[PDB]
Structure 1
Amino acid sequence: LTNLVAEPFAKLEQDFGGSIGVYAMDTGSGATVSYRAEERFPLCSSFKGFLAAAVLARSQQQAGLLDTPIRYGKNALVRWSPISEKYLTTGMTVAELSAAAVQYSDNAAANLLLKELGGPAGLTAFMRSIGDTTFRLDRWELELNSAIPGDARDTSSPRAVTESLQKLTLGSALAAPQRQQFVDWLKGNTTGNHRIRAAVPADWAVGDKTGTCGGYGTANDYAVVWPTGRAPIVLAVYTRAPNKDDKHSEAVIAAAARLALEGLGVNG
């Protein structure tokens, strides 16, 4: 049921000037669209969705975790910490840090939560526990964004991202209350309006998490999409490019998402 209908991904990535990786699954039928789906791409900020899921998994055994207040110093505030910079003098709860990491891609929040889990290896361990053998987080923010060609650090594949996203948002990897909280955080993301969401009709629910490394044309988005009247679709779109100064393209990500939905026969 993979690639029953061919779509012009090669032309798209040639127009972009790099590589595009796509994996999309119709959870009703199991039909899939797959293009470079098992290649590694840098995660960039997109690890923060899985980070929040790992926090929620821990909260299943720690009823007080989400409302625990976390104070932090000015040295925690790295580039692009738009929420946590406004609460430097007060602190925020674990749940607020999680929401900020997901919905505003807040870098200081992500590092604080990584510390709670035992660092990149602790998040990687959570991903292993749900059956993901591809994901690896190796470094903290901001070092994880280097996006070096051929470097497997801080990467996954579009397929493994989609499979893990499906387990966490629709499957049984989280308990039902935590699953719905993860979905609600993704639905409230503010950074993805020009990526997968731009390919999705406004009357369909979407949750997503973006990433943009800042070099090597490297940027991405993954999402769960609920078309009305049919089963949800899960998909991931990742990009990279050969030159350090190559720019990312939001339009290419939206275009790739459109081709994925077309390949699944989903009328938008």
Structure 2
Amino acid sequence: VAEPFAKLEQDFGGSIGVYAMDTGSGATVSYRAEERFPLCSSYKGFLAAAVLARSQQQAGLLDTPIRYGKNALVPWSPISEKYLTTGMTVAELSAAAVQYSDNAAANLLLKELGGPAGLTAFMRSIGDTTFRLDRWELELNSAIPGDARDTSSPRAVTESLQKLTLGSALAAPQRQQFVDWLKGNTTGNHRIRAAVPADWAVGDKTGTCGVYGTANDYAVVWPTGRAPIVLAVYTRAPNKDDKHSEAVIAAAARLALEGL
């Protein structure tokens, strides 16, 4: 089982972490599934989930307009930047955070939740004890070896995604909104999506720290007429200038799906 992944992570020059779960059969694949990896932008899926969970207690939260100044803008905010003159609702910021990895939107939503500690508190509320977000955009992307900040494990990411997209953690309408946002993600076509047949529905959230060969993807997959699959592929590398590889993420994802 682990043999194909070790092979892959030695063509890549760094570490690959993989965890996949068949929700019907209960079969799993694990490879470095309990090691910590930098979240990079991938926490933004759970951010949107946390915002949805809070809207269950705070009616009208999703429609709340957030009017921000030019100061709220940080690099890689392609949606947020376009609406500087009108603002965006919490729901619009959430879709932007998920589907375009919009950094200003994420910081705005983090603020709504009480900062990185607020998001970590939400992940604890659903029983995730591994996840930790400690910093804001963009410092959380530093991905320095040995730093436990802003990390989780492939297994913890998979279990939390499972609880949120298929389980009871979100109420029924919020749960479908979360799934819909992941399904409409625009940044992951070359990662986990590239490993499934095009006739299978996929929702995913990517992460790309830009340094230390650190990039990732987690996804829910619906095989046609089949129980849904949940999986996470995370990578890192020892040298700051080591390049991440979308191909390696897709190859790792295919090995996980061909192995369940």
Tell me the TM-score range normalised by the shorter chain. Answer: over 0.9
For 1:84 and 1:141, the matched residues in 2 are separated by 14
Give how far 1:6 is off. Answer: 5.2
- Contact (CA 8 Å) 1:104, 1:190: kept in 2 or not? yes
In the alignment, what sits opposite 1:54?
A: 50
- Contact (CA 8 Å) 2:215, 2:234: kept in 1 or not? yes
- Contact (CA 8 Å) 1:7, 1:259: kept in 2 or not? no
Change (3 A) 1:199 1:112: same
For 2:201 and 2:56, the matched residues in 1 are separated by 26
Q: Deviations over 1:199-224 (max 9, x none)?
A: 01111110000000010000000000
Give how far 1:40 is off. Answer: 0.1
Give how far 1:230 is off. Answer: 1.2
Q: Which moved more, 1:218-227 or 1:60-69?
A: 60-69
- Contact (CA 8 Å) 2:218, 2:233: kept in 1 or not? yes
For 1:76 and 1:20, the matched residues in 2 are separated by 34
For 1:199 and 1:138, the matched residues in 2 are separated by 32
In the alignment, what sits opposite 1:256?
A: 252
For 1:96 and 1:249, the matched residues in 2 are separated by 30
Change (3 A) 1:57 1:199: same
For 2:141 and 2:13, the matched residues in 1 are separated by 20
For residue 83 of structure 1, give the secondary structure of its aligned residue in structure 2: helix
For residue 228 of structure 1, give the secondary structure of its aligned residue in structure 2: coil
**Out of 150, 154, 159, which is 2:150 matched to?**
154
For 1:185 and 1:7, the matched residues in 2 are separated by 35
Unaligned 5+ runs, structure 1 = none
For 1:7 and 1:110, the matched residues in 2 are separated by 38
For residue 3 of structure 2, give the secondary structure of its aligned residue in structure 1: coil
For residue 216 of structure 2, give the secondary structure of its aligned residue in structure 1: strand
Give how far 1:61 is off. Answer: 1.2
For 1:69 and 1:127, the matched residues in 2 are separated by 25
For 1:240 and 1:21, the matched residues in 2 are separated by 9
Aligned residues: 260
For 2:138 and 2:249, the matched residues in 1 are separated by 23
Q: Deviations over 1:226-247 (max 9, x none)?
A: 0012100000000000001101
- Contact (CA 8 Å) 1:6, 1:263: kept in 2 or not? no
For 1:74 and 1:158, the matched residues in 2 are separated by 36
For 2:256 and 2:28, the matched residues in 1 are separated by 9
For 1:157 and 1:135, the matched residues in 2 are separated by 7
For residue 207 of structure 1, give the secondary structure of its aligned residue in structure 2: strand
Give how far 1:62 is off. Answer: 1.5
Counterparts of 1:39-188 in structure 2, within 5 Å, are: 39-188=35-184
- Contact (CA 8 Å) 2:142, 2:211: kept in 1 or not? yes
Give how far 1:150 is off. Answer: 0.8
- Contact (CA 8 Å) 1:23, 1:235: kept in 2 or not? yes
Amino-acid identity (%):
99
For residue 19 of structure 2, give the secondary structure of its aligned residue in structure 1: strand
TM-score (norm 1): 0.96
For 1:80 and 1:221, the matched residues in 2 are separated by 18
For 2:243 and 2:23, the matched residues in 1 are separated by 33
What value does the CA root-mean-square deviation take over the aligned residues? 0.7
- Contact (CA 8 Å) 1:7, 1:263: kept in 2 or not? no
For 1:95 and 1:6, the matched residues in 2 are separated by 40
For residue 225 of structure 1, give the secondary structure of its aligned residue in structure 2: strand
- Contact (CA 8 Å) 1:77, 1:85: kept in 2 or not? yes
Q: Which moved more, 1:174-183 or 1:6-15?
A: 6-15
Give how far 1:7 is off. Answer: 5.0
For residue 255 of structure 2, give the secondary structure of its aligned residue in structure 1: helix
- Contact (CA 8 Å) 2:2, 2:31: kept in 1 or not? no
Change (3 A) 1:149 1:212: same
